[PDB]
Structures are given as structure tokens and as C-alpha cells.
Design a protein around this nucleic acid. Structure first.
Length: 271
RNA sequence: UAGCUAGUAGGUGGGGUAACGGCUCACCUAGGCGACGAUCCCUAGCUGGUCUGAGAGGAUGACCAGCCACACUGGAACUG
RNA sequence: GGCGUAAAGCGCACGCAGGCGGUUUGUUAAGUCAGAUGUGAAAUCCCCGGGCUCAACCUGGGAACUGCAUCUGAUACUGGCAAGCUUGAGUCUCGUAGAGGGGGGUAGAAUUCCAGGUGUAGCGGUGAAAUGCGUAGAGAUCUGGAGGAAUACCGGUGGCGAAGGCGGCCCCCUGGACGAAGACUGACGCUCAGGUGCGAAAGCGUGGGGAGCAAACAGGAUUAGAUACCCUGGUAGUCCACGCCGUAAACGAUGUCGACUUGGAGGUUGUGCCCUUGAGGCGUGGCUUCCGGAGCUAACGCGUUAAGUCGACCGCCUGGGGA
RNA sequence: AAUACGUUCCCGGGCCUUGUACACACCGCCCGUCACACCAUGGGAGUGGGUUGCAAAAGAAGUAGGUAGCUUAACCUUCGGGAGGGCGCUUACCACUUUGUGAUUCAUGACUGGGGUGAAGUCGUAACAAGGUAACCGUAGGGGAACCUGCGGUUGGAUCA
RNA sequence: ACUAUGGUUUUUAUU
RNA sequence: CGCGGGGUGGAGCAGCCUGGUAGCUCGUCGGGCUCAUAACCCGAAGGUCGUCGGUUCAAAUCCGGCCCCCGCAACCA
RNA sequence: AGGACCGAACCGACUAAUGUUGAAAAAUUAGCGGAUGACUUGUGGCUGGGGGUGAAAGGCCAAUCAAACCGGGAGAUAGCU
RNA sequence: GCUCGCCGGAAGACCAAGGGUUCCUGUCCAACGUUAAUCGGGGCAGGGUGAGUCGACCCCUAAGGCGAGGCCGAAAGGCGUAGUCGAUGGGAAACAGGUUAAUAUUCCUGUACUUGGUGUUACUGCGAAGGGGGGACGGAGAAGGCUAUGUUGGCCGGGCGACGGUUGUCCCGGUUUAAGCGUGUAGGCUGGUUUUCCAGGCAAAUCCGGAAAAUCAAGGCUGAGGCGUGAUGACGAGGCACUACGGUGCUGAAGCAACAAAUGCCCUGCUUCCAGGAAAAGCCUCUAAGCAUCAGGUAACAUCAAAUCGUACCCCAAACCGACACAGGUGGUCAGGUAGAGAAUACCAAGGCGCUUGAGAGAACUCGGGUGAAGGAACUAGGCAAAAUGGUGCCGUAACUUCGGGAGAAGGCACGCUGAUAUGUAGGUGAGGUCCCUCGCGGAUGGAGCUGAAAUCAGUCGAAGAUACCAGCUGGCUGCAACUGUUUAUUAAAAACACAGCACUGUGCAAACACGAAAGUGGACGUAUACGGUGUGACGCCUGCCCGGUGCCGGAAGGUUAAU
RNA sequence: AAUUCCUUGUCGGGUAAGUUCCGACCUGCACGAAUGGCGUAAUGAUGGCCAGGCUGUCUCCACCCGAGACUCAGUGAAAU
RNA sequence: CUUUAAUGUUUGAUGUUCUAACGUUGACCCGUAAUCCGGGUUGCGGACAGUGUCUGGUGGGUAGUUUGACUGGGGCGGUC
């Protein structure tokens, strides 16, 4: 759900939040908690490597088991929880052996319902049944771009991803990025969907409300002195150049992809 | 014309009057009215009747019959 | 007095007060009418006198002033309060066709993109021609894959629906209509100011999406010019999760209910029958196309699904320019 | 002298039917901007009375209750004064008179939208015939005017739709 | 294909 | 400031630079198409080539004067 | 509840006055601007010169900056005073 | 010394740091002191600083550093594992009577108490560096309890009147006693028990975690403060004695009730919202290791140590910091009446101070306050300055608005003292009578006494009841600007920058991008509703053309063309 | 117009009189649609403009009063 | 001498495939019941990344340098 604030007292007028009563809010399961230390937007080489960073209110990290080490174990989803670290929210998995792990919160938000692991598992949602066993046309989430490498590709909020085609010992899926991509089909994925999908409807409303979120204000390149950014202030309304980043890259149209290692996995782009 | 009261809405004991009344001083409560047109401004006294027409309807009240209001303009008491 | 079209039913469904309401035995007697007691003065309108030049007028008598106030009577009928009655109405027994509604599943032509081959100056189009795509391989042709709108033909003497409308294939859920012999309440009904509900489109709003087509704008032509048609492109929009609006030729110009009447050609759907020598026929309801008799309208025509006939309820009309 | 298959299609005519927003009859009819002298209304920086709501200024006389001090008509009286009024004071209610912000109406105004009339002009030629791009309705984007281009609806259209 | 335009006013009714 | 152009039968500009030499599209009048004017196709008349001179065999051009115009422009005590 | 209004602590400077051989190479008064916040503050750490840090001023980097502070090259160089 | 006066959240007072004898005693005046100077936060010589418990060390750790082996970098230098350090964070024991010129949670005197070691007897599995539990930590909001405290009463000690009066109108002095223990109370928290058990707790587990069978209730926890107790001692006004009284003891009164009360204590509580909020160790407990009439454990009893650092004096201050005996600054901390919500503003308590040349003078004038006739913004670049306004509730309140605001709009009315109803009522609090039980930091009923709102009526008073201080001037036209933020330390305080919002675009993850000799980092423990960047500036109207230049995206035939 | 050279453009309104202020022009030698153009409220230590309240700002300045000026005694400078 | 099958085959590319090179930004084994990454085995990629010599292009990121003399002060035009 999504809510706007009432314009009572100055500054509240434009503030829009995402809200959900079907999802729990509180403290995390302590054996999967760490404080996760800040870099400050600086590295071990003594210079700034990031921008728009600093300060903010107190926050910890909820440890999600993206890279898995075993299969076959029966489980139940014990909790469905909010997570400040990710737009996708979090769910607590309780395995029959007395073991707990975190996963991304499934679209159904349902607690106390069983899920099975391994190639013996039923063709049912949320089971740890790898793509070699699944029908084409199924929805997967957190699709595991390369097998054994764990949860990456299509794992942020509102994602589902559908398996479109088969190509021998591989399967091909379609992305909202205009890309259609082939994967080695031993990939596990989450055999389902992820929730939220409302996070782009938020409106920050205030000029200070990013500050408590660890964000710092950043000056326009043509407003600072010519010694720090290739733009550089004038002279009123000067520019007289092609627009660039603080490091000389043309801000529009100019491309920067240079990988050239894995082109055979990418079937279509800008589709 | 979509707002209107507030002695208004419903009770209590004296005082005032020929006499009803929140007439009038106290005290006991918080409503009452209205689109099914409350209420307020603009204009205007009203009527026996007169004028019109086949009548309905419309217009109109001087002059001849009958009330009200008003007395430089505003305001206070007496007399009865 | 009018509301199909001159002037008007206010785009379409539900519905409280308001207003309306079958048939019968009681009962109240407000309304009504009856009867009586008061009133409608003086004038005045009308008829006939008196008196002042005629007459007016001022006066005398009649006749009027069809009205109004009350107290009794009657209760046909409206209101009101009891009580029946089964016909209106609603409920029920049984089911069908179709684009009626809702949620999901799904596919192809053409096109474009993805990935490639066969092959060479054309493509595409006009009265005639460019631009553009095009030799760097455009068009043609074909293999594999995928997207999206709209769902070709059927398709119209057709269905379903309150209007707008709604079609494509399958499944689940689901609204409303219609009839015969009986059952049930026993006037429970009709309409309805306000009230509560519903877009073909275009637009806007929050967020997506871009094949097809295309306002705007560019390129080239035609031409006086061409702000148009032609033609190479193309945004918004169309599509979707939806929201707001209430928009129109929402025009098949018929507000909603009730009832009587004259024929035919034709189709469908119930329901009941047939001495069914039929490859079917006939009653009787609902829908329903097109001619046609009466009657209404200036005229077209309406024509039993009325613009004939006639009760109940709610809105609208009274020159145009200007609005 | 020659040419004539044969009337497909122009010019100019006739009859017939369908349209007609035509009728000195297509040399018909017809739209609006611009030029310009006017008239009324709307909008309006403003200029200003009329009038009034609410909250408030105000305290003359009057009425109601108090009422020192000083006094004195009628009653009482020991003839000294006593009683109540007077006077002079007081607590209420209080005629005028004085503002603050609202509301509303009539006057009035630079400049001005749209509308009707006069100047028959300038501009193109938008609707009526199949009206030279079928028309129209809603609604966006454009547009010197008149319009034009799209999506859906509908014929107040039309060529064997 | 393309080929536009034409002010206002200006007739018949017998006794 | 200083710089660079234009002045061409009536209008507005090609021409010039490259010397063997006066024009185009309109305009004016008269035709052709027509009932007629436009659109359109033809016919006809007229250049101090701003204008005074210079120079040469020879021009509007080479080139000085006397005027008329525009563009950049006043960016220094 | 509060990137609201009052306001002491704290933070900060709109005006007038004082001070710049002044108590002081930024302190003072009287009216103050803010004051649960994009706040402010105690403490430590990390970032360094053609580099840092900056809601980014040739500002800040210990009185210092169109390259600070210290030393070396250095007894720089000066058609001139 | 007495008196007068000023400050009184400070001009009172407690304490670290950091400074460095400033604390004590003497004599030196030469120098010092913005003046004498006999004095000393001066010069100089000597005196004084005691710890099981304090605060620190040990233990543990953040940010971060240090870093063998290992790695990058001509090099300087950097990275980083095993490990190791480290505060502004977490952990064992402390309070205060005695007092000397100067010393004391340290000695003296009491009481409290923790950690490490040695060892016997009896019985006996103990135990990590690992695992679990806990430690444990967002910011506000709102009741209750409580106490040093407040203010009277009583009591003991004293006063009773030169003065208007002071034996029912009294006044002053005093009325005190820790940490901690025991009881286990306000306030606050809340399911256990008995049994078996799987691939988890990257090894082990009897403890967690999870699965099943069984079974029980009304108990399980935390504890401010009271009381006892620490303490028949201490403290105590008053009384008394003796050797050089040259100090140093002896003695000793009252020692209590009422109500209100914190910022402190219950409390990091509870409640509440949100941006979702350190870890480890001690401690409890499970097991791994290792070992055995050892060590450990359980019970009884003896017993050795508490080492390591600091301690005087200062303290918002002429002992710190500002070169100064400096218009100033400096880390922690407390806070009563009377009015008021007062770390507002006024006067004062407790308490301190009269501000480091002094004395004449008393002139226009200057620095700065107070008052002003009549007129008023006429002045001035500028109502600039000055002056006025200034509180609460009720009555009342427009244009414009993003419908929240504008608005405490504007304009005005009220605002003392006494009496009364209830001469003090409602809430809170509080002693009996009555009533009940295991019992007791006892409950039920009850409400004399204490504290005391809220409202109305009746009298009385001045010029004036927000009486003083402190505390908005008001409205209207326009531009600009969203509102809150940021700034050129000393000429700009803003319309700039930031910023909600927006377009265009790059980025498929070993992302793009950034640091940079190059690794390893940062992006991100993020993965296309995720991240990068530019500019414009929230919200509403919206937002056209030119592809010639130059760049970018894309394209490959033809031509120029290097190494070779 | 925070843009207009020449411009007090020219004009209405605001004053007795207005280079500014308020509302226009369409003549922008030269604004202009994210180097964004168009626009409004609370509001800002924001420029201008109109009025009242209060006022020694101004008219004409007056009186009152600390601390300094003056004179001592101590200590006792300096730029020049 | 044409063009070429089958057999033999040098070579730079294009395009697949294979894999010992190389990688792991996977797993496993052990260091280590180590938050470095060393070795080993496997899975999956795969002849490349990366880097040095030659070389074309571009290259303010970075360096070094100048803009003559006269102009009756400086300048526009003029002058050498």
C-alpha cells in the first residue's frame, strides 16, 4: 500500500511512503545479524571513490543466504519481515533440523507453509528445484545468472522473470532491461516471485529526508570552480562545451560497456 | 437569495399590567429553524373596489368607502 | 395547449419522502353535498321609478353579489382506521440461445526486432514524379525465436443488453429475460423532487508500454500558394493496472406504468395440442422485421411493439442575433 | 479535291432523374479575420458617495433599587422634633454622539475580449452538386482569416457503399 | 492531373 | 573611433574581378487564352550604370572628387 | 507527533554603538536570527600541497594561500632605483 | 569587629584535566604588584602528599592503527592474514566519623567486600581460546511511587521588650547520622514441568534450536524507598577539667509529626512512533582438550596476597587556556521561596563579594541614560534611529490560499480585595470506629485531620487590577523568492548553492564508474522499482524550430594511410 | 521587465507637485520555453511603494543626572 | 595452362567445436574447526583478459614557451 502525509506544519505536504500491514516489523533473528561497517565512500588507497554519501541514522544488516551449500532439506517459512537494507523485504526459513536462514520475501507473504529442496521436490512454487526439472513458461525470481554462484539477476522488488525458451542444456529468459539472456539451467532460482513492487511510488517530499538515509548534498559541476569539475562556473549562464561527468564521460548517448567475455549468453538487447 | 436565531428552544419564584407573554429582575438547562425554500436585501402601506375581458386571468386602490403608520429629523416622559 | 421531426423526454438504470392505487364488509365524517343560523355593509353591475338642461349624477325599490363562517344530517367517493377477496405485484415448480458481466488459460496472418542464408537495382507509388530505404544488399524468398494491437471470413432479412455498447478458442463463477397448470402472502403494487448507481471516443492523473497507425513537426512533390490529397519519417494517443469526468448525431429523435383495437408476408423462443399418411401442421404467450385499414398530425407518416384511444407519476416548451 | 473506323472524350445545347444552404438564376449562393466610425454589455489598475452586519465608544434626561449630609407640607409631636420624601449623592438599564473591519449597490475609468450596425475595400475561397479535400458531433494538436489533421460515433452524405 | 474570381440595388396582380 | 559593402532604362539586383561589352525577373502600355480581370505566354518603349572628372584604343568596373545608403560599431586617458 | 510559534541552555549575526598602538592580530554592549534538527556538542581517529576538505568562497588547511609552513639549491635574477 | 550595600542558576558551590608549590612555616625588600606596601596567586630556605576497596592497571572491545608469513610499489610508502593494540564504550570490592599550621574514600576508628593463589577430610567429572543464553545500548511521549529537599507545627536551648504593640498575632538557635546488610514493599517484567529425539549451533554437546509423547497451575521475576541494621557508637547547643591548658579530651538537651517536592531514584522503566537502532568479556551454562584416589567440583575448616599508577594546591579560575596579576575562554556537576509551566523576568534564601592607584573637584563639552509644550515624517538616500506595541481567556475576524494556512488577522471586553455557598466543595492525601485472614513492608469497609482546584453569587477600593520587571506595532500595493537549510572567520547573508520534483542517458554484474606506477579496495554484502551522471528546480500552466559546425550513436563499399 | 541604449519612452492611477511606485503598450536594435518560459499562499533579518499608531527624525532645541574632561599625590609612557 | 576430387598440407582471418594453455570474480581437500590466498582435485569457462617492443590516430590530463619596433601617455587606422 502507499500513503501521502497531510500538509499540516511546514514540510509534510509532498511526503509519500510505502506501507504494508501483512508484513512484520521489529528486530532481526540475532544469529543472522551484523552491524556491517561503512566505507565512508573511500577506499584503502586514501581517496574518494563514491559520492552523495555520509551520516544517516542507525542501521544494521540482515544476512541473506544468497550462496547455498546444500540441497534436499525440508523447511517451513517461520517469519515474513520488513528489511531497511533492501526494497524486496525478507523471510525467515526454518529447516527441520533446527536451522534458520533468511531469503527474500515471496510475493504471497504467507507464513507457516512448507517448502522442499532438491530434484525430488514437487513442481510447486518456492521449492529448490533447479531449471533442468522445471517447465518452460514458469516464473522463477533471483534467477542465478550462473549456476552455483547463488542469488543474482532479477532479485530487486516487483521481479518475477519468466522462462521463455529452451536451447538444449540451457534456458532463456526475458528482462525488463530489454535483454534476453541464456543460462546454464543447473541454476536453482527461487521458483516463484518477490513482493513489494510499490517502491517507485515513494516521494521523499523534504530536503533533509535523505540526510538521515546516509546521503550528502552534491554541487553541480558548472556551479563549482573549473579546477574540480570539467564544467566549471563562469560568468552567468556560461557553458560552451559538450556535457560531461566529473571524470570527462559524455553524459548522454556515449557508451561504456567493454566486458567482451560472455557475449554468447546475451541473445537480444534493447528488445 | 443558504444560511437563520439567541428572551433563541423548553422549565422555576417574585415584581409590572385591566390582562397573555422571558412585559421585567433573578435561576435551571442547551438547544431551536431550513432546500417540502428557513432567512435577508430591493421595492412597496393595505382594503371596500376600479379598470379590462365572454370569463378565467391581468392591472390597480387618487377621487368615493374602511384600517394602519407618521407629525421639522431623531430621541424622553407625563396625562388617560 | 404541446414534447418523433416546427417550441420541448432534458444519455441510461435503481429508489426514500412526495404523489398515485384494484375489489368488498364495517367505521371516522376532515373534504364534499344537503339543511339551518349568521355573512357578502354604504356604494355598484343589471331592471324599473323619483329629482336636477338629455344623460351622467344624487336618490328610491327590485334583482344580484354564483362567494364566506358555524351547527346538525348523508357517506357515493377521496382521506383515515379496521378486516376480508385474489385478479395487480412479488415469491415458487423447470430450462435454452447469444459479442450480457467477471477471473484466468491461449493462437495465427501481417509487421518489427533478434540471428542468418539465396540473389542483385530496384523498392513503393501517381494524372505525372521526388524524398526515403538501397549495392555497405533495399525489395523478393526462406529457416529458428519473440513482442503487441486487433481478432480476417462468418459479418447480416443476426444475437445479447438499460444507454454507451458487447464478438474472437477453452474453463470456472455469474447478472437479467420468458411461459403453462398448480402452489403462497393477501393490494405486499406504480411512479418518484432529492438520493445511489453506469461511457462509444478524445483528454487529463499515478505508473508502464511502443509492433501497427498517427495528429504536431521535418523531407519531397503537385500548385498562384498547397498550410490538403500523394509520399519517406514521427511524438502524443491508441494498449494495460487503473483513476477522474460524466462527454456526443449518448440520433433507431419514441420518459416510466396501465388498457382497448385490424389484416398480411416472415423469423425466433416458450408453452399446449394434432384422425400429424407433411419431405410436418396448428393453437397461445414473449421477442420481432417490413407493408397495410381506422384515426391523429401542416406534412412525412405513426399504424396493436402507435404519433389512434385514455387513466397515474416526474421533468421540459412559449422567436432568432446576443447565450 | 480529300477525309469520315467510329462518338469512348472536351466545347456548346436538349430531355430525364438524384441532389439544390441556387433563383437578375454557377458571371448563382456563401465564411470570417484585417482597415474604420459608432452602440450596449463583460473584464478592469483604480476613483468614490449610498447603505448596512458584527464588536465597540457613549452616559443627558427617565425608571428600579439604594440614599450620607443638610433640610422640611399635609401624618405623629413632649411643639424640642419625629416618620417618609426633598436635595445631594449612588448601582443598574440609557437618546444622541464616535470608530474598526466586513458586506453590497449605483455611479465612474485608462485599456480591452466577444457582439450588432455602417464603409460593398484587402485577403483567400470554408459550407451548398460527389461543392473543386463528403459532411457533422465530442475532443486533442496545429492554425492570418475562413479552417485543417487525427480517434470514435452518426448520416443532417455519396460514386452499382 | 489542373483551371481562381464576379459588390449593393434593378419585374408582371388591370375594373 | 576605425573597417567592409551597395548606388546598373521605372523597381530590386546579376554583370565587373577574367576588357573586345549593356541585362534578368517584374513594371508600363498593346496583344494571345476569355464574357472578363488575375494565373500564364508574347509584343513594344527607356539606361547622365548616383554624379563631376581622371585613365586608356577601349567600360558601369580601372580610379580621385561631390553626395546617398547599410552592416560591424564607440569594446581608451 | 512535529526540517511548526514562544523561549532559558546552546547555536548564530540584521542594526546602532565600542574596540583595531584594543583587555584581545575577534573581543564588548543593547534590541537579538535560530533553538528534536538537513541541530549542536565533549572525546578520539582518518584525509596533505598543484593535494586534501568544502550544500564548493582563490573559502578552509593553526594570524599565512592565483599554491600555505620550514629548510636546501641561494650570495636566485634585475640593460633598473 | 560592627554596620551598610551589591550579586544570589550567580558575583553561590562540588570536581576531573592541565598547570606546577600556588598548601604550611620563616625572613627578604634588592627586583615584583599598571599606587603605598608593614601584605603575598612575589623572592628565597625548609615543611607537607600514606590506598585490598577510590579513578587508573589486569580482562574485553569500537572507529582506527600496528602487522610475522604473504602481496603491490624504481623507491619513499602502502595493503593485509595469523595475530595485537585501543576510548569517547563494556568489565570485581567504599563509605565516612576522628582531626593538624598544612594530610587521610589512603592514616586513625568502624562497617562493608571482591579477585588470584596454597591445602586437608568425605563424596565426586571437571572445563576452553569453542557453542548457546545474556550483556545490549533509536528518539520522543505520559501516569504512578519515592528521597536528601520545601514550609509550618511540636520539642529542647534562649528572648519577653527604651521604641505603636509584642504571654494566644509571638521570635530566634538547634532538631543530624553514609556505603551497605536483612526484610522483600511502591513502580516495572512474566508460562513452566517431566520424558525421548534427526543431517542444525561450519568440530563436540546432556545447554540452545527444532520434532513428538506427557503433564501442572497461580505461581515465576526485578526492586526505589520505609523499618530493622550499620549505630547503646557517631553528631549535638549547653556543661567541665588539667600538666608549660603550651590542646585534648571528658561530658551532653531536643533529636519528632504534618503535608507538598526534583533535574536525582524506581528508569535504558512503561508507553509511543519511526529513519529500526556497537560488539566482546566478565557471569550463567553445554561440550571439545587433558588427567586421575592429580587438578577441578560439592560440603565442612584452616590459610597466603592484593602488587602496578596517581593523590598537596587550583577550578569558570590574577594556580588551567589567552605571551600579561589580560574587557575573554576552558571538560563534568548542582539549583529552595513568592508570582509563573519557569535553567522567563522580579526580589531574595544558602552563600559570597564591595570588583587591585587613591584624594580633590564639579566648567562649557564628550561618552551614555531619563523627561518634554504644540505640530508630526514635513526630515532622511532610507520612519534610519528613537518612541510606542508587548500577557491570558472570551467576543470577533477579510483579500488571497498548495484548503494545512492567512489568524494571537484586524477590532475590542474582562482581569484587585473581602464575604458566601462548602466560613475549603471536587481530585489527591489521611487517623480512628467497624470487618476479615495464611498472617503482615496485611487487607476490606471507612474517612476526624492535611493539601486544595474549579464555578457563581454578595460586598468593598484607587487615576490605574496583564498595576512594577520580562513579553507582538498594525494594515495595504508590487517585484523577487517555494517552506526549513548553506556561505566569502573582519565590507555581500542573498534571488546564488543545496533541495522535493523532472528529462535525457550510461550500466547485465567479475556492472558502469572512482582511487591509482598496481594490486587490493570503494560501487555493494547492493543486482535493472539496483547503481552511475548531467542540468533544471518543490506545487499548478506547460515546454516550438535549425543536424550547417562540433561531438556522440550507427554504418561499412570506394579513396588517402603506418609498422611490416 | 533585476532586460529598453535614446528614453523621467507615452499614458491612466497614486501626491499640491511622483526620474521611483502601481497598470498598460507590443516599438523585445538584444526575454523565451529544464542555460527552462508562464504563475500563486503561509513565508524571508529580501529591494521599492501607500497609510495609520507612536515619535526631539524634523521645526527651535531646553532641563535633569553617572563616567570622563579640570587639579592634585604615587607610578609614569610614545610615534616625532 | 585452366579448375578439382581424394590423399598429404603451410597460413592469417572469419565461424563453431575441442582443451593441455589460462582463469575461477564456483565447489571440494588441507593450511585453519584462520574475514589474506598458497598448493592440490574437480565443475564451468576457454587460446582471451593482461602486458612489452614497433606503429597510425587522438590527446590540456601534463609540461615548456611567446603575443617584434614606432604610435609627440595608451589605442583604432598608418609606418618598417
Amino acid at each position: 500500500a502507499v500513503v501521502k502525509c497531510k500538509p499540516t506544519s511546514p514540510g509534510r505536504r509532498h511526503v509519500v511512503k510505502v506501507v504494508n500491514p501483512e508484513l512484520h516489523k521489529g528486530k532481526p533473528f540475532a544469529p543472522l545479524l551484523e552491524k556491517n561497517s561503512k566505507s565512508g565512500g573511500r577506499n584503502n588507497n586514501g581517496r574518494i571513490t563514491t559520492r552523495h554519501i555520509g551520516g544517516g541514522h542507525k542501521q544494521a544488516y540482515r544476512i541473506v543466504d544468497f550462496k547455498r551449500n546444500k540441497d534436499g532439506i525440508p523447511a517451513v517459512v517461520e517469519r515474513l519481515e520488513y528489511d531497511p537494507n533492501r526494497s524486496a523485504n525478507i523471510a525467515l526459513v526454518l529447516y527441520k533440523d533446527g536451522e534458520r536462514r533468511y531469503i527474500l520475501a515471496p510475493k504471497g507473504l504467507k507464513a507457516g507453509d512448507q517448502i522442499q529442496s532438491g530434484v525430488d521436490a514437487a513442481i510447486k512454487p518456492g521449492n529448490t528445484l533447479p531449471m533442468r526439472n522445471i517447465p518452460v513458461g514458469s516464473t522463477v525470481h533471483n534467477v542465478e545468472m550462473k549456476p552455483g554462484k547463488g542469488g543474482q539477476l532479477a532479485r530487486s522488488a516487483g521481479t518475477y522473470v519468466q522462462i521463455v525458451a529452451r536451447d538444449g542444456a540451457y534456458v532463456t529468459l526475458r528482462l525488463r532491461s530489454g535483454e534476453m539472456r541464456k543460462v546454464e539451467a543447473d541454476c536453482r532460482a527461487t521458483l516463484g516471485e518477490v513482493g513489494n513492487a510499490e517502491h517507485m511510488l515513494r516521494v521523499l517530499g523534504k530536503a533533509g529526508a535523505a540526510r538521515w538515509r546516509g546521503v550528502r548534498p552534491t554541487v553541480r559541476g558548472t556551479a563549482m570552480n573549473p579546477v574540480d569539475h570539467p564544467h566549471g562556473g563562469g560568468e552567468g549562464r556560461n557553458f560552451g562545451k559538450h556535457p560531461v561527468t566529473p571524470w570527462g564521460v559524455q553524459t548522454k548517448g556515449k557508451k561504456t560497456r567493454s566486458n567482451k567475455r560472455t557475449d554468447k549468453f546475451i541473445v537480444r538487447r534493447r528488445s
